[PDB]
Amino acid sequence: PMILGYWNVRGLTHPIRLLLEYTDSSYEEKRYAMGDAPDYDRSQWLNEKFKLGLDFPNLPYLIDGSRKITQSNAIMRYLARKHHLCGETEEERIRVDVLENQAMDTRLQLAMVCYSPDFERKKPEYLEGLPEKMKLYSEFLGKQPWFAGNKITYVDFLVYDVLDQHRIFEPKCLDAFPNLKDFVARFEGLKKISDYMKSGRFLSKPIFAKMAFWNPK
Amino acid sequence: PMILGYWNVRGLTHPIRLLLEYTDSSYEEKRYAMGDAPDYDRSQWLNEKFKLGLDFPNLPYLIDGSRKITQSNAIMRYLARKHHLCGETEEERIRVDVLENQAMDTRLQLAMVCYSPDFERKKPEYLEGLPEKMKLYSEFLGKQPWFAGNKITYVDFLVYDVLDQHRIFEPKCLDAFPNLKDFVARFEGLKKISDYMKSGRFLSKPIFAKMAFWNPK
Numbered sequence: 001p002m003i004l005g006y007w008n009v010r011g012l013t014h015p016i017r018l019l020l021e022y023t024d025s026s027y028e029e030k031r032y033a034m035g036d037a038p039d040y041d042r043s044q045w046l047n048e049k050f051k052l053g054l055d056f057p058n059l060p061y062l063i064d065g066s067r068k069i070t071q072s073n074a075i076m077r078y079l080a081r082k083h084h085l086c087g088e089t090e091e092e093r094i095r096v097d098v099l100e101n102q103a104m105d106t107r108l109q110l111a112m113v114c115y116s117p118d119f120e121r122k123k124p125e126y127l128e129g130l131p132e133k134m135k136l137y138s139e140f141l142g143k144q145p146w147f148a149g150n151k152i153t154y155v156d157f158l159v160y161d162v163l164d165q166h167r168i169f170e171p172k173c174l175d176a177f178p179n180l181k182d183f184v185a186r187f188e189g190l191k192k193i194s195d196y197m198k199s200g201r202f203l204s205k206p207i208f209a210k211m212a213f214w215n216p217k
Numbered sequence: 218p219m220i221l222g223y224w225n226v227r228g229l230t231h232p233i234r235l236l237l238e239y240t241d242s243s244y245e246e247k248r249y250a251m252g253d254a255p256d257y258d259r260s261q262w263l264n265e266k267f268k269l270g271l272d273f274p275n276l277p278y279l280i281d282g283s284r285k286i287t288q289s290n291a292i293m294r295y296l297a298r299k300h301h302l303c304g305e306t307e308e309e310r311i312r313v314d315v316l317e318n319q320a321m322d323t324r325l326q327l328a329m330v331c332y333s334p335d336f337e338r339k340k341p342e343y344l345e346g347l348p349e350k351m352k353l354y355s356e357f358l359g360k361q362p363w364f365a366g367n368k369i370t371y372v373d374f375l376v377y378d379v380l381d382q383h384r385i386f387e388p389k390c391l392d393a394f395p396n397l398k399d400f401v402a403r404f405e406g407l408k409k410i411s412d413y414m415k416s417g418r419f420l421s422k423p424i425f426a427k428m429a430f431w432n433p434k
């Protein structure tokens with residue numbers, strides 16, 4: 001089987017866990033523990049960080065027989081290629097490439113706020129700008145069923161994660177954007193995904209590592 | 218022609234400027250000014266940020282007739298696809314995807330240090346870890362002429378930029394890694410690139426925006 005390795009948190013690996021599920025991939029997971037305070041021991045991972053044969057050791061990592069892959073987006077495109085979940089025309093490739101990169105920037109901005117010691121101050125300011133972020137995703141989707149167009153691709157997995165994390169943070173955030181509420185529902189309605197969400201393999205939370213100031217531990 | 222828009226700094230756009238050059242693309246550049254202190258006025262860009270028809274307005278942006286693209290990596294893959302500068306086998310696609318994402322993480326870590334108010338403190342600590350980063354790039358390249366293998370691809374443009382920025386920061390950093398010194402030289406020896414470096418279109422510096430604590434203004 002493929003081996004997926006990552007911390008015992010949702011972090012930036014939810015889309016990969018979801019895609020492995022969707023595609024019916026045979027896999028095993030290693031979920032590394034993180035020390036509690038104050039030294040947040042990472043010994044468990046650091047012991048093996050250089051013993052796995054990865055080119056640029058990192059978490060997450062995917063091991064597929066001879067292929068050893070790091071960088072979340074790279075793991076996403078490898079599974080995409082194997083299962084034909086890429087854009088098939090130039091317009092679709094474009095949309096996929098922009099959104100891939102935009103889904104990372106949206107996740108990183110949320111992580112910045114949640115990890116800052118002055119969270120209680122940043123939260124309000126993050127929320128102020130939330131209607132603009134959501135609007136741009138909503139206008140992008142339009143009346144299409146999925147982000148690339150008529151076909152589900154791997155980017156729908158990463159945008160689902162951005163949306164989900166934001167609705168956990170601020171439950172009301174999708175109410176003024178119905179195509180986005182609808183997308184969430186439709187993604188959560190795919191059989192393999194609803195089965196997974198009800199299984200003991202599921203890990204929705206915590207999102208962030210234990211030092212976060214909002215949902216880490 | 219295509220329109221490339223970005224701040225009047227090197228920032229994360231050097232690879233795009235280089236690739237436009239390499240490929241002999243017909244283009245025009247808009248380079249936006251940034252206010253000097255303390256308010257670092259961005260009015261010049263913000264005036265047009267929403268008037269260009271971009272889906273997720275950002276800098277850099279590329280306009281190619283009907284296509285309007287944001288996110289640096291997305292702009293890189295669009296030019297790559299048009300000019301056949303992608304990996305052609307699965308092993309090559311993999312390498313390209315990992316390095317694309319790893320070149321971003323290396324650039325972001327350098328930017329974090331250069332932008333921190335406590336730079337003079339971070340510099341030493343960044344340097345301590347530099348031999349490990351360089352080693353991993355060097356072992357990755359091996360005896361190949363380019364990063365993907367035998368073919369130049371767009372990732373060579375982004376890794377060239379990482380390497381160049383680091384040798385500006387710490388001139389001695391490539392001396393213990395000759396395949397990396399050699400790659401730099403070979404990239405800088407391509408005709409279109411050496412012509413560009415000597416033209417009035419060239420912008421090597423400043424790297425960072427004016428609020429940086431090391432090379433911004």
Ligand SMILES: N[C@@H](CCC(=O)N[C@@H](CS[C@H]1c2ccccc2-c2ccccc2[C@@H]1O)C(=O)NCC(=O)O)C(=O)O
Pocket residue numbers: 001020021022023024025026027028029192196200201202
């Ligand atoms: N891709 C389908 C496959 C579904 C799937 O991969 N189940 C695994 C067992 S599940 C996994 C695991 C994943 C997450 C959390 C825990 C576990 C786990 C727990 C106890 C014992 C073994 C495990 C394992 O580490 C399995 O063994 N499948 C057949 C095989 O690999 O030949 C789906 O994604 O829905």
Ligand SMILES: N[C@@H](CCC(=O)N[C@@H](CS[C@H]1c2ccccc2-c2ccccc2[C@@H]1O)C(=O)NCC(=O)O)C(=O)O
Pocket residue numbers: 007009010011012049057058059060070071072073107111207208209210318322
């Ligand atoms: N661009 C890469 C980035 C790879 C990378 O940074 N990995 C972090 C873990 S990922 C990150 C994160 C990002 C967003 C949301 C949460 C997390 C997170 C969660 C739990 C614990 C640590 C984190 C972190 O804050 C890691 O711990 N690396 C092992 C190492 O450094 O030895 C990728 O897309 O794959």
Ligand SMILES: N[C@@H](CCC(=O)N[C@@H](CS[C@H]1c2ccccc2-c2ccccc2[C@@H]1O)C(=O)NCC(=O)O)C(=O)O
Pocket residue numbers: 218237238239240241242243244245246409413417418419
């Ligand atoms: N891709 C080849 C093409 C080379 C190329 O694109 N030169 C542009 C003029 S150059 C550009 C510019 C680029 C950077 C900085 C300044 C300028 C600039 C300055 C004054 C007046 C016009 C300009 C313009 O904004 C040109 O007009 N070429 C023919 C055309 O577009 O049909 C190369 O990359 O080496």
Ligand SMILES: N[C@@H](CCC(=O)N[C@@H](CS[C@H]1c2ccccc2-c2ccccc2[C@@H]1O)C(=O)NCC(=O)O)C(=O)O
Pocket residue numbers: 101105224226227228229266274275276277287288289290324328424425426427
């Ligand atoms: N993931 C995206 C990221 C797009 C993005 O963040 N763009 C910044 C400029 S880029 C950044 C930077 C990153 C690394 C090195 C330097 C810079 C930089 C230089 C000058 C001035 C501002 C900067 C910044 O610190 C910008 O100003 N956006 C317009 C806006 O926000 O309205 C991409 O890869 O394309």
